[PDB]
Enzyme design. Sequence first.
Site, PDB file in Angstrom:
ATOM      1  N   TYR A  84     -31.505  15.642 -45.659  1.00 64.75           N
ATOM      2  CA  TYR A  84     -30.270  15.533 -45.088  1.00 64.75           C
ATOM      3  C   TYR A  84     -29.097  13.633 -45.576  1.00 64.75           C
ATOM      4  O   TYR A  84     -28.255  14.080 -46.284  1.00 64.75           O
ATOM      5  CB  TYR A  84     -30.235  15.976 -43.531  1.00 64.75           C
ATOM      6  CG  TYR A  84     -29.034  14.520 -42.383  1.00 64.75           C
ATOM      7  CD1 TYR A  84     -27.281  14.595 -43.153  1.00 64.75           C
ATOM      8  CD2 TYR A  84     -29.416  14.619 -41.319  1.00 64.75           C
ATOM      9  CE1 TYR A  84     -26.260  13.747 -42.891  1.00 64.75           C
ATOM     10  CE2 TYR A  84     -27.565  14.014 -40.959  1.00 64.75           C
ATOM     11  CZ  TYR A  84     -26.676  14.139 -41.776  1.00 64.75           C
ATOM     12  OH  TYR A  84     -25.251  13.419 -40.294  1.00 64.75           O
ATOM     13  N   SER A  98     -24.605  21.129 -46.273  1.00 65.53           N
ATOM     14  CA  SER A  98     -23.754  20.034 -46.114  1.00 65.53           C
ATOM     15  C   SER A  98     -24.132  18.689 -47.306  1.00 65.53           C
ATOM     16  O   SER A  98     -24.296  18.570 -48.743  1.00 65.53           O
ATOM     17  CB  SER A  98     -23.830  19.614 -45.270  1.00 65.53           C
ATOM     18  OG  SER A  98     -23.928  21.159 -44.171  1.00 65.53           O
ATOM     19  N   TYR A  99     -24.228  17.361 -46.506  1.00 69.89           N
ATOM     20  CA  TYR A  99     -24.778  16.045 -47.004  1.00 69.89           C
ATOM     21  C   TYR A  99     -26.123  16.532 -48.021  1.00 69.89           C
ATOM     22  O   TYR A  99     -26.184  15.972 -49.280  1.00 69.89           O
ATOM     23  CB  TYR A  99     -24.352  15.014 -46.060  1.00 69.89           C
ATOM     24  CG  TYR A  99     -24.391  13.894 -46.944  1.00 69.89           C
ATOM     25  CD1 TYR A  99     -23.487  13.175 -47.061  1.00 69.89           C
ATOM     26  CD2 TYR A  99     -25.829  13.463 -47.730  1.00 69.89           C
ATOM     27  CE1 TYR A  99     -23.312  12.010 -47.680  1.00 69.89           C
ATOM     28  CE2 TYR A  99     -25.959  12.442 -48.353  1.00 69.89           C
ATOM     29  CZ  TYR A  99     -24.296  11.481 -48.588  1.00 69.89           C
ATOM     30  OH  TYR A  99     -24.676  10.447 -49.417  1.00 69.89           O
ATOM     31  N   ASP A 137     -15.337  28.268 -46.190  1.00 70.18           N
ATOM     32  CA  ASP A 137     -15.490  26.903 -45.698  1.00 70.18           C
ATOM     33  C   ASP A 137     -14.734  26.083 -45.888  1.00 70.18           C
ATOM     34  O   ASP A 137     -13.803  25.550 -46.471  1.00 70.18           O
ATOM     35  CB  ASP A 137     -17.643  26.787 -46.758  1.00 70.18           C
ATOM     36  CG  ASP A 137     -17.500  25.404 -46.108  1.00 70.18           C
ATOM     37  OD1 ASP A 137     -18.164  25.191 -46.187  1.00 70.18           O
ATOM     38  OD2 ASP A 137     -17.246  24.873 -45.194  1.00 70.18           O
ATOM     39  N   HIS A 166     -19.136  27.065 -42.921  1.00 69.83           N
ATOM     40  CA  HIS A 166     -20.073  25.970 -43.263  1.00 69.83           C
ATOM     41  C   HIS A 166     -21.568  26.315 -42.597  1.00 69.83           C
ATOM     42  O   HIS A 166     -22.043  25.816 -42.967  1.00 69.83           O
ATOM     43  CB  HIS A 166     -19.137  24.681 -42.933  1.00 69.83           C
ATOM     44  CG  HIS A 166     -19.885  23.743 -43.452  1.00 69.83           C
ATOM     45  ND1 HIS A 166     -19.939  22.968 -45.286  1.00 69.83           N
ATOM     46  CD2 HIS A 166     -20.777  22.551 -43.425  1.00 69.83           C
ATOM     47  CE1 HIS A 166     -21.368  21.803 -44.989  1.00 69.83           C
ATOM     48  NE2 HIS A 166     -21.181  21.762 -44.157  1.00 69.83           N
TER      49      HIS A 166
HETATM   50  C1  LIG Z   1     -26.395  18.135 -42.512  1.00 71.80           C
HETATM   51  N1  LIG Z   1     -25.834  16.869 -42.191  1.00 71.80           N
HETATM   52  C2  LIG Z   1     -23.965  17.071 -42.449  1.00 71.80           C
HETATM   53  O1  LIG Z   1     -23.563  17.455 -43.625  1.00 71.80           O
HETATM   54  C3  LIG Z   1     -23.059  16.273 -40.970  1.00 71.80           C
HETATM   55  C4  LIG Z   1     -21.814  15.769 -41.977  1.00 71.80           C
HETATM   56  C5  LIG Z   1     -21.754  16.233 -43.546  1.00 71.80           C
HETATM   57  C6  LIG Z   1     -21.078  15.188 -44.547  1.00 71.80           C
HETATM   58  C7  LIG Z   1     -20.899  15.319 -45.454  1.00 71.80           C
HETATM   59  C8  LIG Z   1     -20.734  16.922 -46.104  1.00 71.80           C
HETATM   60  C9  LIG Z   1     -20.573  18.158 -44.408  1.00 71.80           C
HETATM   61  C10 LIG Z   1     -20.417  17.184 -43.521  1.00 71.80           C
HETATM   62 BR1  LIG Z   1     -21.517  18.963 -42.036  1.00 71.80          BR
HETATM   63  C11 LIG Z   1     -21.431  15.001 -40.975  1.00 71.80           C
HETATM   64  C12 LIG Z   1     -19.442  14.642 -41.793  1.00 71.80           C
HETATM   65  N2  LIG Z   1     -18.866  15.978 -41.210  1.00 71.80           N
HETATM   66  C13 LIG Z   1     -21.674  14.978 -39.855  1.00 71.80           C
HETATM   67  N3  LIG Z   1     -20.608  13.851 -38.544  1.00 71.80           N
HETATM   68  N4  LIG Z   1     -22.629  15.119 -39.178  1.00 71.80           N
HETATM   69  C14 LIG Z   1     -23.088  15.673 -39.972  1.00 71.80           C
HETATM   70  N5  LIG Z   1     -24.788  16.209 -39.197  1.00 71.80           N
HETATM   71  C15 LIG Z   1     -25.178  15.970 -38.380  1.00 71.80           C
HETATM   72  C16 LIG Z   1     -25.749  16.984 -40.382  1.00 71.80           C
HETATM   73  O2  LIG Z   1     -26.815  17.015 -40.064  1.00 71.80           O
END
Ligand SMILES: Cn1c(=O)c2c(-c3ccccc3Br)c(CN)c(N)nc2n(C)c1=O
EC number: 3.4.14.5
Length: 724
Positions: free
Chosen positions: A505, A588-589, A666, A698
Site C-alpha cells: 500500500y 489503489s495506491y 472506477d 474501485h
Molecule cells: C490502499 N489504500 C489506498 O489506496 C487509499 C487511498 C488511495 C490513494 C491513492 C489512490 C487511491 C486510493 Br483509494 C486513499 C485516498 N482516497 C485513502 N484515503 N485511503 C486509502 N487506504 C486506506 C488504502 O488502504
Amino acid sequence: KTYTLTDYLKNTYRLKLYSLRWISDHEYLYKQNILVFNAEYGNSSVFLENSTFDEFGHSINDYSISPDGQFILLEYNYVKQWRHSYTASYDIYDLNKRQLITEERIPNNTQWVTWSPVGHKLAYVWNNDIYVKIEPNLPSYRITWTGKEDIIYNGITDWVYEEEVFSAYSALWWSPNGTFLAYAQFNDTEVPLIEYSFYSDESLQYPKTVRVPYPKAGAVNPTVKFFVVNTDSLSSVTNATSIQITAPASMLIGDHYLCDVTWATQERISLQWLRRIQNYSVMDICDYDESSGRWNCLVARQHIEMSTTGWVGRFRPSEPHFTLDGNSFYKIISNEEGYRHICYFQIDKKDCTFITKGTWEVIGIEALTSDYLYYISNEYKGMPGGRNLYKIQLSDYTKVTCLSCELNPERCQYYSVSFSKEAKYYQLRCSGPGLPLYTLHSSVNDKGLRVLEDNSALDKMLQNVQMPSKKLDFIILNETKFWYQMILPPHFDKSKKYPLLLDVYAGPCSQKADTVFRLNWATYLASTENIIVASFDGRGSGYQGDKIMHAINRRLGTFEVEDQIEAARQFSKMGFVDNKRIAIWGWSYGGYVTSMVLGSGSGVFKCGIAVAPVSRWEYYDSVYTERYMGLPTPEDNLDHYRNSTVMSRAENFKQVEYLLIHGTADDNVHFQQSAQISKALVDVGVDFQAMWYTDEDHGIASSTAHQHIYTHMSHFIKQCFSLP
Ligand SMILES: Cn1c(=O)c2c(-c3ccccc3Br)c(CN)c(N)nc2n(C)c1=O
Ligand SMILES: *[C@@H]1O[C@H](CO)[C@@H](O[C@@H]2O[C@H](CO)[C@@H](O)[C@H](O)[C@H]2NC(C)=O)[C@H](O)[C@H]1NC(C)=O
Ligand SMILES: *[C@@H]1O[C@H](CO)[C@@H](O[C@@H]2O[C@H](CO)[C@@H](O)[C@H](O)[C@H]2NC(C)=O)[C@H](O)[C@H]1NC(C)=O
Ligand SMILES: *[C@@H]1O[C@H](CO)[C@@H](O)[C@H](O)[C@H]1NC(C)=O
Ligand SMILES: *[C@@H]1O[C@H](CO)[C@@H](O)[C@H](O)[C@H]1NC(C)=O
Ligand SMILES: *[C@@H]1O[C@H](CO)[C@@H](O)[C@H](O)[C@H]1NC(C)=O
Ligand SMILES: *[C@@H]1O[C@H](CO)[C@@H](O)[C@H](O)[C@H]1NC(C)=O
C-alpha cells in the site's frame, strides 16, 4: 487441509462480530430479531421482532431508532452511489402505537436522513436540498432551495468531500440538543466532469456516459459555504432563515476546504478550515448571539494548526473534544519532536499543553469525562502496529492506566472501543493477533463484565486446518526502525527457500504491518500455495512520527517506492526467501507503488500485479493529491508530477512480468490511469497482461467480480512462481 482460495472467496471460515448501537448510558442494541441488552445484567428483551415487518413488501436494508426511542426509521430501496453515498426510500414506524406513518412521508430517492441527538426531530436531504420534520407525521419544512443535481449540494457532500475530506456523504450536524442544524453547501459549477462509459445490462443497446464532477490535481475545486439554521423557530408560512458562518480571513484569501465540524456546547460550534495548500489550518470557535440572532467567531478564538515539514493532520486536522462547559478542548496535534499527541487547549489562550509525551503516537481520543480522558495509542512495548485503550487522569497527567494492555497480551494487541452515551461502560474490540475478542467493561471500576463474542466457533474449525502464522518485526534502515510483517506458510522451514509476494500500500500515513488478525488472499497464498506474503511500512508510513511520515512530502513515488525494493532486498538476506521468485502486488495506491517498483529496473521482482493503480498524479483527485504533492504548476511541484509517472518507466517493464487490472466504472481511480499505462507499455514494445472489469468500480466488490479477480491473480502468481 489448508485454507483454500475457495475458502476465502466463499467465506468458509467466518469471523463473528459483535456490532452494537448504544442507545443510552447503559443500554445497547443487537441483531440476532432486534434485542436490547443491558450492560449491568445482560438480560435482553426483544425491541423489534424479526418479522414485525413481514407484511411490508420491501427488504429492509437498515434500521434507525430515534434517541428517545419513540420512533424507528426503516431504510429500503438502497441504491449505492460512491464509497459512502447512496439513495434509499424511508419509512417511519411508531413504536408506542405499532404502525407506519402514511401521511407526509419521506420521498423516494432520499440522499441522507438523520435524527436529532435527542428527541425525534428529523432532517433529510432530497434532490440536494435539506428538509426538516419536527414530528414524523407532520409535513417537512424545506430549508434550502438552491440544490441542483451535480452542481449544488446542501447538507450532502460532492464526490471529493465524500471520499477525501469527510469520509461520509452527510454534511449535516445537529447541535447536542437538536435546536440548531449546521450544514455545508458545496458548489461544483466550474469543477470539471470525469466521463466514462457504463455498459450496464446486456439489454442496454447504447452505453451510458457517466459524468461526475470530479476535481483532478490542480483543477477547479468545489467551493464550500457553511450555514446554521434554528429548527426550534421554524415557520410553515415564511422561508427558513439560515445564518451563514463565513470562513476566516486567512482562508478566503484563496482556495480552501471545510475539514471539520464539531459542536462544543448548545450555543457553540467549532469549524476547521484548510487552505488548498494543506499545511495551514484554522479553527473558528463560533458562539450564538441573542438579540442579533447570528453567529460570531471572535478572531481571538482562532487556533491555528500548521506544518513546516508537511501537511496538517494525518489525512485531515484531528477533531476537538470539548469539555462539558466548552471552554476547553483536547485534540491530537504533532508535538515539537514530530510525534502526534493530545494537546489541552484553552478557548481563549493561544498555547496548549501536551498531556501525553513519547516516541509513539496517539491514534484518537475515544471518550472525555468529568474525571478521565480515554484514548487509543500504539505505546505498548513500542509497537506502532499495536492498539491499546488508555485512561489518563485530568488532575494529574502522569497518572496513566492501560485498560487493555494486560487483558490478554498473547491474543490481544489491537484494540478499538465503543463507549456508552456518558462513557459509563465500554465495549472493547480486539482484532488480533489472536482471534477477535469482543468484551464489555464497566468504566467505573474497570472490571470485565462479560465476554460478548470470543470466536470459539471459528477457533475449533481452524484447529483442523493448517493455518499460516504472522511475524511482526522491524528492520533497521539508516539507524531507524521500520516495521514489517510476514504471513508465513504452515510448518514453516527456515532452511527451505520460499517465493515471496510483497503486499503493498505504502501510501502516506499507511500501515500494512500490524497486529490485526485477517482471513484474506494472503492467508490462502501462505496456507495453500506456500508463499510468504509480506508487508512493509517504510518512509511515508504513519503512526511513527512526522520524521517518517513527511519523508515523502512533495515527493510521492520516491522514498516509499525505494523502501519496498529495499524491504524485499532485506528479506532476501534472511535466508528463507527464493530470490528468483519475488513478486509484488497492490491495490489503489499500492497499485501505483507496485507499478513504480516494477518500472524501476531494480531486478529484485520477477513479476507483479497492479490493481486500479494511480498511473500519474494529475489524474487523481485534488484533495488527496495536493495534500502531498501540491499543485502541478511550474511555480510549485510540476517537475515532480512529471517525474513520478509510471508511464515514464514503461521501458523497464521488459525485465518483469506485469498484470494490470482495472474496473471500467472506477469513479475513484479512473480507468484512464491504466489506459495510459497500457498505451505506454504498448509504445515501448513491452508484453504484459491486462484485465478490465466491466462496470466494476474501485472496490471491484461485486460478488462475481471479486471471485473472478482473485482467481485470475492466483493463476498469474502461481504461473509466475512455477506452481501447478
Ligand atoms: C490502499 N489504500 C489506498 O489506496 C487509499 C487511498 C488511495 C490513494 C491513492 C489512490 C487511491 C486510493 Br483509494 C486513499 C485516498 N482516497 C485513502 N484515503 N485511503 C486509502 N487506504 C486506506 C488504502 O488502504
Ligand atoms: C456557485 O458558483 C458559481 C460559479 O462560480 C456561481 O455562478 C455565477 O453566478 C453569478 C451570479 O449568480 C454569475 O454572474 C456568474 O456568471 C456565474 N458563474 C458561472 C460560470 O456560472 C453560482 O452562483 C454559485 N452558486 C450559488 C448560488 O451558490
Ligand atoms: C421561498 O423561496 C423559494 C425559492 O426562492 C420561493 O419559490 C420561488 O418563488 C419565486 C417567486 O415567488 C419564483 O421565481 C421561483 O421560481 C420559485 N422557486 C421555486 C419553484 O422554489 C418561495 O416562493 C419562497 N416562499 C415564500 C413565499 O416565502
Ligand atoms: C432487565 O431487567 C430489569 C428488571 O428490573 C429491567 O428493568 C430491564 O428492562 C431488563 N432489560 C431488558 C431490556 O431486557
Ligand atoms: C415511490 O414510488 C413507487 C412507484 O415507483 C410508489 O409505489 C411508492 O409509493 C413511492 N413512495 C412514496 C411513498 O413516495
Ligand atoms: C436546547 O438548547 C437550547 C440552547 O442552549 C436551549 O434554548 C433549550 O433550553 C434546549 N432545549 C431543550 C428542550 O432542552
Ligand atoms: C506550505 O508549503 C509550501 C511549499 O509546498 C511552503 O512554501 C510554505 O512555506 C508552507 N506553508 C507553511 C505555513 O509552512
